[PDB]
Paper text:
We sought to develop a general computational method for de novo designing protein nanoparticles with geometries tailored to present antigens of interest, focusing specifically on the prefusion conformations of the trimeric viral glycoproteins HIV-1 Env (BG505 SOSIP), influenza hemagglutinin (H1 HA), and respiratory syncytial virus (RSV) F (DS-Cav1). In the first step, we de novo designed antigen-tailored trimers, featuring N termini geometrically matched to the C termini of the viral glycoproteins. In the second step, we generated tetrahedral, octahedral, and icosahedral two-component nanoparticles by designing secondary interfaces between a designed trimer (fusion component) and a de novo homo-oligomer (assembly component). This design approach yielded nanoparticles tailored to present 4, 8, or 20 copies of the viral glycoproteins in defined geometries.
Five designs comprising a panel of unique geometric configurations, T33_dn2, T33_dn5, T33_dn10, O43_dn18, and I53_dn5, ran as monodisperse particles of the predicted molecular mass by SEC-MALS and were further investigated by SAXS. The experimental solution scattering curves closely matched the scattering curves computed from the design models for all five designs (metrics in Table 1 and Figure 2—source data 1, bottom five designs). Due to its high valency and production yield, we selected the I53_dn5 nanoparticle to investigate the capacity of its two components to be separately produced and assembled in vitro. The two components of I53_dn5 were re-cloned, expressed, and separately purified (pentameric "[name]" with His6-tag and trimeric “[name]”). Nanoparticle assembly appeared to be complete within minutes after equimolar mixing. In order to obtain higher-resolution information, three designs, T33_dn10, O43_dn18, and I53_dn5, representing one nanoparticle from each targeted symmetry (T, O, I), were subjected to cryo-electron microscopy (cryo-EM). The final resolutions of the reconstructed maps for the T33_dn10, O43_dn18, and I53_dn5 nanoparticles were 3.9, 4.5, and 5.3 Å, respectively. Some structural heterogeneity was observed in the cryo-EM data, particularly in the case of I53_dn5. In 2D classification results we generated particle projection averages that range from spherical to ellipsoid shape, indicating some degree of flexibility. Backbone r.m.s.d. values estimated for the asymmetric unit (consisting of a single subunit of component A and component B) were 0.65, 0.98, and 1.3 Å for T33_dn10, O43_dn18, and I53_dn5, respectively.
Residue numbers in the entry:
A (entry chain A), C (entry chain A), D (entry chain A): 1 to 153
B (entry chain B), E (entry chain B), F (entry chain B): 1 to 119
């Protein structure tokens, strides 16, 4: 339906909770390539975690732009799992607001590639890390980036 | 009863400019109630409007028999006669209308010009 | 009371939870047409889901504007049902804020056509999908778009 | 203490939950008139409900301004009662944020004439609809509009 | 039967703005069938339209006795009372109309202003 | 009698564009006098006008049974069938209308285009 061969899509992702994230990052890449996105047009970089991603993604885009490779769409990826503290609730919220603001501030679609789970099993299922539960949502993020980046042109 | 509905129907048709209905509805209403002078005058007005001046006269004359003080009808009757070229009859009908209603200024001027033409 | 025959109203909607949404989308369209909105002036397009709609609606408007068919009002439509994760709470909130901001940013009324339900029965009732409960709220959204788009002129 | 005879105060209000609202709207009007506000300077208009008011109030002001009757203060009025869904929490919040932003964006005081109640009895008491409980808060809103509109000049 | 034709005739006259006919046709139709609440409400509307607010009330009240859930009529009745200066009666009729139909936004604003004036 | 008034009332409603009345008045008139083919055709025209093409057909067919030489009706019937997508039925009704009235130029062009579409 959509052709992503002309798009530059970046992924900026957390290092923390790598098992879940690497499954999510690849899920998105495989689909982007299925839509024709060239592997060389998929930019994958990391940051420590979820506090960095909400602004890290802008800094990431600015660098790619300066280098002559501005992105058409971005999928910051990371996993928040509720712990004993309330960092989860405050990060989930402010992250979401930054990512929504960035849909206009960066000029490109910003895909919420961040999980807001209470348990590990939920985040793991969302990444398709669990064979019997959910699916790898990274794939939808990938597909969405291609559609959002082409649909509205 | 049925005549009232028939008179209301014809009346609406007269107001709306549809004489086929205005005529049939009043004829029906009149068959049910023949003494309605107003309807007879109006029936004459429908025929008058259609250029059917002789018919208009027949109905105007009937209506006047029922109520001869209708100055407007006397005028309208004279007009139907003028349209037929019947100036002598027509001038009397306009003069009677003016005598019944001295404020019929239009009858004054029209009977005056008609008199000039009557000879 | 209001005449919508001169208005262009767009609907951007989620693909996910289609049974509820299609009832909502049509509800709004039927009423818009009852207010005289021409069917050709009702623009209906989709996105995957609720994360796309909060900004997708701007991208949607910009495209319609470039095409010579700017909208007078928009009703993004979608359904959020609380699951086992907290994505519901964070989407509900940020979506609402984006849609409220967009009432000024787009220059047109933006109707909150999004549901924030805890169960399916509640979302289904709101769409009038359940004969014995609520009504199809899509109809109110449709009517509101017509009024908001004409009332303040 | 304050003289409102020179002020234009608008009320934009929800149609929904009219029994409570009409008591609130009149409460404010009676007091505004007690402060000398002329009845002709009190502009009362409606919208369906609480989603419309947060931006509807700007559209309302812009129209009054174009007509040569810009407002000095505004009191959007409406009632939110918690139901089985979370629309209450998200509307309460975004409404509040829009109304606070509008205190600067419109150049005039915006009075939070919106109720955020969990029950009907609470909203009814706040409107003074219940003889034995609270008072008609609409009266305070009216008085506040007069003070805010004069106090800081 | 005759009432239907009389109601159709009056109805056409209401739509066309002719109340002399709309009134007579409905009165005739109602004599033939007195339980037609809609016609009684409409009859009240004809009188209302003519400025005959007390008459409008009489017919609206009859119509409400036959069918009291007609919110629009409750409103129209209150309006006839407001035109007569009967604010207290009138405000109750508008409030009842709103209670029957909460979406009558116009009643909300008009009863609100009327209440200000009622005192 | 009553049918005439009912036909006059419906007729006025047809002319004025009010089909709720035009339909009820003709149905009443027809109950009183079922052989009025013109009224049956007109009844079909009211339904036709409302987009109620199947109903229009029912009445047009009845009217044709009473008087099948009405070329205009044959045409109108074909049109109701075309609106329903019934091209084969519809083309015969237009062709019959043209055979009855060879001067129906509009039927010629419309049946010609319809034939192209019929296949």
């Amino acid at each position: 339906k959509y052709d992503g061969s002309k798009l530059r899509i970046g992924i900026l992702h957390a290092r923390w909770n790598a098992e879940i994230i690497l499954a999510l990052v690849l899920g998105a890449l495989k689909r982007l390539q299925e839509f024709g996105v060239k592997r060389e047009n998929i930019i994958i970089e990391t940051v420590p975690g979820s506090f960095e991603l909400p602004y890290g993604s802008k800094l990431f885009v600015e660098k790619q732009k300066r280098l002559g490779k501005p992105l058409d769409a971005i999928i910051p990826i990371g996993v928040l799992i509720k712990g004993s503290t309330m960092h989860f609730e405050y990060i989930c919220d402010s992250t979401t607001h930054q990512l929504m603001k960035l849909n206009f501030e960066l000029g490109i679609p910003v895909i919420f590639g961040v999980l807001t789970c209470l348990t590990d099993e939920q985040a793991e299922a969302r990444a398709g890390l669990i064979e019997g539960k959910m699916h790898n949502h990274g794939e939808d993020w990938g597909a969405a980036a291609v559609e959002m980046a082409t649909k509205f042109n | 009863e049925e005549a009232e509905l028939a008179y209301l129907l014809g009346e609406l048709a007269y107001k709306l400019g549809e004489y086929r209905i205005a005529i049939r509805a009043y004829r029906i209403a009149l068959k049910r109630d023949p003494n309605n002078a107003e309807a007879w005058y109006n029936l004459g007005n429908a025929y008058y409007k259609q250029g059917r001046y002789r018919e208009a006269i027949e109905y105007y004359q009937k209506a006047l028999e029922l109520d001869p003080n209708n100055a407007e009808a006397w005028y309208n009757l004279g007009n139907a006669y003028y349209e037929r070229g019947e100036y002598e009859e027509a001038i009397e009908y306009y003069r009677k209308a003016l005598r019944l209603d001295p404020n019929n200024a239009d009858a004054m001027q029209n009977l005056l010009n008609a008199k000039m033409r009557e000879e």
